[PDB]
Amino acid sequence: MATIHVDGKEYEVNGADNLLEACLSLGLDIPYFCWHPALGSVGACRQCAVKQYQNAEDTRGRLVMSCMTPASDGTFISIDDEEAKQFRESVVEWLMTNHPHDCPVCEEGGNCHLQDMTVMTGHSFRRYRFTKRTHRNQDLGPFISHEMNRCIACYRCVRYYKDYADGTDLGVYGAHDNVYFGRPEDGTLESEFSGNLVEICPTGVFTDKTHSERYNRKWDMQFAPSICQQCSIGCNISPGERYGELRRIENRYNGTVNHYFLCDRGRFGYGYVNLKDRPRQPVQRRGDDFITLNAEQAMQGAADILRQSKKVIGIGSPRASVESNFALRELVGEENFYTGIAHGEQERLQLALKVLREGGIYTPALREIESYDAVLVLGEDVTQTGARVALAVRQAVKGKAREMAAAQKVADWQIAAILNIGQRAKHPLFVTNVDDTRLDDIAAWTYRAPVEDQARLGFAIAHALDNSAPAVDGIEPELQSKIDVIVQALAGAKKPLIISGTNAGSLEVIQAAANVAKALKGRGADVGITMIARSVNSMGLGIMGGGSLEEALTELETGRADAVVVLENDLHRHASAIRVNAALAKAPLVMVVDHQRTAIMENAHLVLSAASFAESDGTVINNEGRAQRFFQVYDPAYYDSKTVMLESWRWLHSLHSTLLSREVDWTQLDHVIDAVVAKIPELAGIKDAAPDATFRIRGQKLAREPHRYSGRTAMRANISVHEPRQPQDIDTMFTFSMEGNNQPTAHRSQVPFAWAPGWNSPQAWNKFQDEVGGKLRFGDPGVRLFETSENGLDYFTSVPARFQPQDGKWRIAPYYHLFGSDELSQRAPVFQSRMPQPYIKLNPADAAKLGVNAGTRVSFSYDGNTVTLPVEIAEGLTAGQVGLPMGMSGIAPVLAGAHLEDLKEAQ
Amino acid sequence: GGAGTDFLTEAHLDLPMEFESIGKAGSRLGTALAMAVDHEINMVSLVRNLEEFFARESCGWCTPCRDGLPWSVKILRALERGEGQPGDIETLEQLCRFLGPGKTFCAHAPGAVEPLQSAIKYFREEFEAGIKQPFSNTHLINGIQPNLLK
Amino acid sequence: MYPEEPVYLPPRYRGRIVLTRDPDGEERCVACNLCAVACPVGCISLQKAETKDGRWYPEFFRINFSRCIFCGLCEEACPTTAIQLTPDFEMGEYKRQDLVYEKEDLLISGPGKYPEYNFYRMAGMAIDGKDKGEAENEAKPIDVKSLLP
Amino acid sequence: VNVIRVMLSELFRINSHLLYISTFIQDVGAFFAFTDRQKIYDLVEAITGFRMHPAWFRIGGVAHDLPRGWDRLLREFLDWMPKRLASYEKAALQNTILKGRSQGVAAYGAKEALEWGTTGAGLRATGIDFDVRKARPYSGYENFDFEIPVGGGVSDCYTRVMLKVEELRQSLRILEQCLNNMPEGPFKADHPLTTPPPKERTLQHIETLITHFLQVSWGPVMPANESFQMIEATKGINSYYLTSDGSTMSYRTRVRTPSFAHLQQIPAAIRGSLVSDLIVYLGSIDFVMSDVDR
Ligand code: SF4
Ligand code: SF4
Ligand code: SF4
Ligand code: SF4
Ligand code: SF4
Ligand code: SF4
Ligand code: FES
Ligand SMILES: [Ca+2]
Ligand SMILES: [Cl-]
């Protein structure tokens, strides 16, 4: 767009960018701290100084800040000007005057932007001889640690936590050189995106406590490109391992999905992988005797029983991969494969898929959501189910300021100006839930009502946008006025966005959202539809299909099925525990393939030690239908040779072979992928999700370990002074070593970790992108399985009737918790403190009627079981409804929409 | 005209109080409210007072003004206590040039170095009397022979 | 002659590697893993651990002297003068597995060649004994709520 | 640093020659290296802490400063070798057995030396005066007064060994100038890329601690370029062709070693002679298979 002249050499850059962003994207190295590709430019640290000349004849220019200077055409700048170099070194020296001598004992060592810039500025000699300022630290909760002494006052944390994530508990206090960055008081950071501070802070003030316990330097970590498995958003992550334990989860830049930010559940909810109660070897239960078997013995014995079984059924899971679920389907037969999900959950998931695959409306990617000008969330508590979508919705709401600023011809990178021009102006946002939501602060209106009433609102908005849409009866004049504001806001929007999901527990809320989106599409609008699922591969299981858990249980209950192979499913989160336990007790053979110790395992005849995402390779499909491949991070048997933790697809494929040929076949991942694409045409893009195992970079495999990995001849010396053979990988293109390629210019899309000479901090992603803040140079990884259909679905004419409280029955309202609702994350120990204490929420009036107050324990019966829970008062909750923490052990997510009966004060 | 204006001498007393005249003299008119310094006042202690104010009135937004002014105050305090070490005046002058217009985010620091640079320009002898000790920022670690830079 | 007549080894002789303690009797090691990465053979393995006070220390420290080349790159890399090559040359063994030394075979009871150096007296990280502002060239914490301008 | 790096180099140049001259004389003729070699190792051990593989030199200087008392040890050695050397030459000069079994064996002229890449005493014996220390001065060798022993046109086994004896005398001269003119100042350069940085500052200064941390961990980042330094080693011209791609590790490290070329000339210089002559030739060529194979 514009022609600039840096140090004589001429370059073509976008005039809409700043010189820092432009030159960094050209590969030129300019030190910086306060500027962030996502937080914009402020001009505080004054580190990106560059000399600027007025013309080609100017020999005496001026020092300007590249981040606050436009990359205009005809710009003459010099990064190597002696004065610029001297000033840039002086800025670092001033920051080093009051900097603590705690490199050896800080957790950012080797991953510190400040260390990288000190060296880049060539400042190795101290002249300052006076005292260094000190600050007392604060408690910031169980995930983030505080060390204010290591601060450089770049203001990045407050700009991200408050201006991007919209948090309210982080701030800047004090004045002059006594500026302090932290909470107004000691306590837990309340932002669901507080973890991103560890990568945002260029120093070691904010660090990860989950890693600090078993801390290791970045050069000693074995990393693998993986997809987060805690919700359905499918964020790219870089899990790291040392000594056979997952040590930390870092963000993997996906310019199409999570870009630079993750959420707390995915960043700090991995400890379940390091649980010491996990199955490590195949075990058989003979009466009350447990026998540890080997892979070969386990396959032969199991196939022998399966060969003589009348009907072998298989139960899959939304947690399992596409390959793992497919392997079970082939082992038991498509007719005998059942999705381990409740009938209702499957119906809602399939309806959500039909909308995205046959609705004729585009489904946006996580980053694309930040470009819509109006958002309607129907029944989905995103902040607690798909947190990263809530962060994207926040950036979308901030568009009004950006539009207002562009009208005044203000540069897109000048955030301060954009914010002042904007003030409290925001794009229209409307959220509906059974009670309060975390997005209520930026929402124009929040409709707190039973799921049925929330759906009626959707049908109503649709009728108002298109009379052809089914009309709703019983809307009170007061609500109608509120509905009109939403209709005008969506009608006036140029790019509207409708967001729903299966977490509401209502099929109507998904149908209502489909009608609203169809209405806006008919009015010729760039409408977008987003559906939030519940697990990492919920959409994948939905595309594959199968019977329900209820139908699988009935087979075992009628006795028609004698053998049940359960795959990575506890079954108690999808069906009654009494029913599942009884059904599994009538089966001659019960085999469980899971990587976690579940309750159903207690009465299983055989338990196969499956691997977790860290020790496995496979493909998962996110809510947008993007098939993304995860790769094995480390070999589980490297340190403990006895460990026999194999991928679920490998276990099931080998069993199928032993059942048909009496011989074991541990195939390669590519073969299983080829089988899926051939048998299931819908899951065909999974082949292009990532290159095969034969992919190489100039003959070199991709590497998982940094080039300075240490301990090669001493890490396992305790077990044997004889160094073990490098674990070999036949499934992926990654080597379990450093003898591979991790070049920032390697023609690939899967980057295990970001490192570039001179850039050891997360700022090294800049060298792996086409343009800083853009996309990976050779494309972002992942393939959308389906495109927008040419034709759409007919309007759903099933408007539900208004909710009516019924004496005795108590509608269970779904309350979700980022910390607690997910199954695996709750197993992680660091989450115990963050997770909420057990409760039941009641409308103040209902509590008064039952003569109970806050704290009063109340007894109630569900599946023939009396449960006691402390009462919490929820004013927003409508009467006739009770609030329960969905997903929390005991409260199965299926309880949503069910009814409690004998609700009374306990004892 | 102000604590943030460059000091002028008796020779500049015959200059008209206009924006251009004082600017050419090497200072700024400012508020036109002048202040007279008598011979009984030490320039080092006077500028130390000025810097102590300018340094604590900083808001803390940009490094040059937030971490550079506090350094000068410490050097000036050492000089007035007779504990100055060689290289102090050079650091003061470097600060004056690197905290000048354009380098900082606003003009608080550009004007904070105006009194300092002028005092060193017309009364350097006062700043020199301060340096009485040899330069040393390192103690002697036993077991490690030091790199003797010459 | 040997072994009846001992051999004079100069003070800088690069021999058996030992972990040392600070003048206060505490281990000088902070488990930063600088000696290990700087090691050209990879014969050093350690894991960071923290005392309730907040002091970093090696939960385990392993040196495979079967691979060690006694180059002193690790001793040159400590920011704490904990790892030091001492003047000792007699380390012959019968089984190679016994050439794998742990902290019990490395941590001595003294400061070693460096007599008086404590990194924890230079660090800004507070530990039992040294609070914020009690390190070298360190001012005392000034609260942001202070009344002084 | 220049004078320190010359001093240590000349100590090892004497050590290697002593062993080479001793072995040749022992086999061909009838010079105890052990004793004289131990005295050198004692000074090297006092300075480096190691004997055969000092690994003391660093990028920007030497790992530590000269240990207090180095001057005493050096003076003692420079007062012991003078006489010991006199014995070494006398033998070769008057060992008729050596002269008879070495003179006119594996003889080659300038043309053969140039066509086979022969460097060191072999090249000088042919009369070609090419010593890198004088031809392309490095490490401040131009600040030292020494002569290059040159032959008279024929590189035979005897002439090669005799030049190595005359080299010992010149090395002792450089070592005396190092002892009497050791400069006072830094043992490590004041450059941002000196590795590791002065330890005293690393132990007490954050800026130097940061520089050390990264230089000993990820490594020193060397900007993309190609460098080359040839030096006069103990057996001939040794060079390092280094290529950086802008990282903390070399993209290519080519080590040209003189021994590899000296072993390729053997077929052309020993053809027509007897096996006994070959064994004498193998001895006259100061060579180690580690230098040949790398
Ligand atoms: S923040 Fe960086 S420079 Fe500061 S002590 Fe920690 S690792 Fe060192
Ligand atoms: S805490 Fe981190 S992000 Fe915040 S001002 Fe300090 S260095 Fe910058
Ligand atoms: S939004 Fe979902 S996929 Fe992304 S980090 Fe959070 S839990 Fe993981
Ligand atoms: S120069 Fe202005 S913006 Fe910068 S620290 Fe001083 S008062 Fe703040
Ligand atoms: S011995 Fe020294 S370098 Fe190694 S981990 Fe301990 S403190 Fe760090
Ligand atoms: S002396 Fe050398 S080889 Fe031995 S542990 Fe230290 S760095 Fe490694
Ligand atoms: S990065 Fe430009 S002023 Fe800080
Ligand atoms: Ca694998
Ligand atoms: Cl209604």
C11 to chain B: nearest residue by CA? B143
* CB proximity C62 to A under 8 Å: yes
Nearest to D208 among A99, A104, A124 (CB): A124
CA A785 to chain centre: 19
CB atoms within 10 A of CB A872: 18
Answer yes or no: are the C-beta atoms of A20 and A91 closer than 8 Å: no
Count of positions (residues) in chain A: 907
Ligand 4 neighbourhood includes B65 CB (under 6 angstroms): yes
Nearest to A131 among C56, C79, C138 (CB): C138
The identity of residue C95, as a single letter, is: K
Tell me the three state secondary structure of residue D134. helix
Q: Which residues touch D92 (CB under 8 Å, ≥6 apart)?
A: D21, D25, D29, D98, D99, D158, D161, D162, D165
A215/A208 Cα distance (integer angstroms)? 9
Q: Residue B136 is encoded by which pair of tokens? A: 């040393």
Tell me the three state secondary structure of residue C115. coil
Nearest CA to ligand 1 atom 7: A109
CATH dotted code for A809-905: 2.40.40.20
How far lies D198's CA from each of D59, D60, D195, D212, D222, in Å? 12, 10, 8, 9, 19
Ligand 2 neighbourhood includes A64 CB (under 6 angstroms): no
Helices A113-120 & A82-97, crossing angle to 10 degrees?
Answer: 140
Contact list in C for residue D203 (CB cut-off 8 A) is: 79, 81, 117, 119, 122
Candidates A103, A101, A98; CA nearest to A133 is A98
CB atoms within 10 A of CB D140: 13
How far lies A479's CA from each of A456, A500, A510, A678, D78, in Å? 11, 20, 21, 52, 105
Distance of CA A669 from the midpoint of ligand 8 (Å) = 7
Strands C44-50 and A9-13: unpaired
> B22 forms bridges with which residues in the sheet?
none
* CB proximity C139 to B under 8 Å: no
Phi, psi at A618, each rounded to 5°: -175, -175
User: What is the end-to-end Cα distance of chain A in Å, rounded?
Assistant: 76
CA–CA min distance B58, chain A (Å): 5
* CB proximity A178 to C under 8 Å: yes
Which residue is listed with tokens 């386990």?
A298
CA D144 to chain centre: 16
Which among A106, A119, A131, A149 is the top mutation candidate for probing chain D, defined by the most D β-carbons within 10 Å of its own β-carbon? A119
Q: What does R_g of chain C's alpha carbons equal in angstroms?
A: 19
A686/A630 Cα distance (integer angstroms)? 12
CA D28 to chain centre: 24
A130/C139 Cα distance (integer angstroms)? 9
Strands A618-621 and A626-630: antiparallel
* Closest ligand 4 atom number to CA of residue B110: 1
The CATH class for the domain spanning D1-293 reads mainly alpha
A410/A418 Cα distance (integer angstroms)? 7
Phi, psi at A610, each rounded to 5°: -80, 165
How far lies A402's CA from each of A256, A412, A662, D272, in Å? 21, 7, 66, 91
* CB proximity A695 to C under 8 Å: no
Side-chain half-sphere of A782: how many Cα atoms within 13 Å? 31
Is residue D180 exposed (0-12), middle (13-18) or buried (19+ Cβ within 10 Å)? exposed
B90/B84 Cα distance (integer angstroms)? 12
Contact list in B for residue A48 (CB cut-off 8 A) is: none
Q: Which residues touch A521 (CB under 8 Å, ≥6 apart)?
A: A360, A361, A527, A792
> Which residues of A have a CB under 8 Å from any CB of B?
43-47, 49, 62-64, 86-87, 90-91, 94-95, 97-98, 126-130, 152-153, 155, 172, 174-179
DSSP A241-298: EETTEEEEEEEPPBTTTTBT---HHHHH--GGGG-TTS--S-EEEETTEEEE--HHHH
Contact list in C for residue D53 (CB cut-off 8 A) is: 69, 71
CA–CA min distance C76, chain B (Å): 11
CB atoms within 10 A of CB D39: 18
The domain ranges of chain D are: 1-293
C29/C61 Cα distance (integer angstroms)? 10
Q: Cβ–Cβ of A708/D190 closer than 8 Å?
A: no
Instruction: Please give the DSSP secondary-structure letter assigned to residue A740.
Output: S
The identity of residue B145, as a single letter, is: Q
Candidates A589, A579, A591, A584; CA nearest to A556 is A584
D81/D83 Cα distance (integer angstroms)? 5
Answer yes or no: are the C-beta atoms of D259 and D234 closer than 8 Å: no
Ligand 6 neighbourhood includes C68 CB (under 6 angstroms): yes
A866/B4 Cα distance (integer angstroms)? 78
What's the CA dihedral at B48, B50, B51, B53 to 10 degrees? 120
Method: cryo-EM
Answer yes or no: are the C-beta atoms of B60 and A174 closer than 8 Å: yes
List for chain A the helix, strand, coil content (%; round to 5).
Answer: 30, 20, 50
Q: Residue A768 is encoded by which pair of tokens? A: 């792996």
Which among B56, B57, B62, B113 is the top mutation candidate for probing chain A, defined by the most A β-carbons within 10 Å of its own β-carbon? B62
Residue D272 region by backbone torsions, left for phi larger than 0, else alpha for psi between -120 and 50, else beta: left
Distance of CA A116 from the midpoint of ligand 1 (Å) = 10
Nearest CA to ligand 2 atom 6: A151
A442/A447 Cα distance (integer angstroms)? 14
Candidates A612, A609, A618, A650; CA nearest to A634 is A612
Q: List the shell of residues around ion ligand 9, using CB closer than 5 Å.
A: A 802
Strands A734-735 and A702-703: parallel
A106/D84 Cα distance (integer angstroms)? 58
D17/D19 Cα distance (integer angstroms)? 5
The identity of residue C67, as a single letter, is: R
Is residue A807 exposed (0-12), middle (13-18) or buried (19+ Cβ within 10 Å)? exposed
Answer yes or no: are the C-beta atoms of D28 and D102 closer than 8 Å: yes
CB atoms within 10 A of CB B53: 14
Is residue D148 exposed (0-12), middle (13-18) or buried (19+ Cβ within 10 Å)? middle
B60 to chain A: nearest residue by CA? A176
A279/C125 Cα distance (integer angstroms)? 40
C43 is in an annotated binding site: no
B62 is in an annotated binding site: yes
Answer yes or no: are the C-beta atoms of A704 and A607 closer than 8 Å: no
A438/A441 Cα distance (integer angstroms)? 7
DSSP A20-79: HHHHHHHT-----SS-BTTTBB---S--SEEEEESSSS-SS-EEEEGGGSB--TTEEEES
A618/A873 Cα distance (integer angstroms)? 44
Candidates A475, A501, A396, A479; CA nearest to A443 is A396
Nearest to A125 among D207, D246, D247 (CB): D207
A689/A884 Cα distance (integer angstroms)? 39
Domains plus CATH for chain C? 1-122 (3.30.70.3270)
How far lies A846's CA from each of A126, A434, A849, A886, in Å? 69, 16, 5, 21
Q: Residue C131 is encoded by which pair of tokens? A: 């609070």
**Chain D from 133 to 192: CB within 8 A of any A CB:** 190, 192
Q: Residue A587 is encoded by which pair of tokens? A: 């089966």
Distance of CA A490 from the midpoint of ligand 9 (Å) = 20
Tell me the three state secondary structure of residue A403. helix
Strands A881-885 and A840-842: antiparallel
Q: Which residues touch A858 (CB under 8 Å, ≥6 apart)?
A: A840, A842, A850, A852, A868, A869, A871, A903, A904, A905, A906
Q: Residue C24 is encoded by which pair of tokens? A: 């206060």
Q: Exposed e or buried b for every residue in C113-130, given b needs 16+ CB within 10 A?
A: bbeebbbbbbbbbbbeeb
A240/A218 Cα distance (integer angstroms)? 9
Strands A563-567 and A312-315: parallel
A707/A737 Cα distance (integer angstroms)? 9
Count of positions (residues) in chain C: 149
Tell me the three state secondary structure of residue A338. strand
DSSP B118-147: HHHHH-HHHHHHHB-S--------TTS---
C148 to chain B: nearest residue by CA? B56
Ligand 6 neighbourhood includes C36 CB (under 6 angstroms): no
* CB proximity C126 to D under 8 Å: no
Nearest to B56 among A62, A129, A176 (CB): A176
* CB proximity A629 to C under 8 Å: no
Choice from A226, A227, A230 to test ligand 3 binding pocket (greatest atom count within 8 A of CB): A230
Which residue is listed with tokens 């996110």?
A622
CA A28 to chain centre: 33
D262/D266 Cα distance (integer angstroms)? 7
Answer yes or no: are the C-beta atoms of A5 and A79 closer than 8 Å: no
Omega before residue D196 within 30° of 0, cis? yes
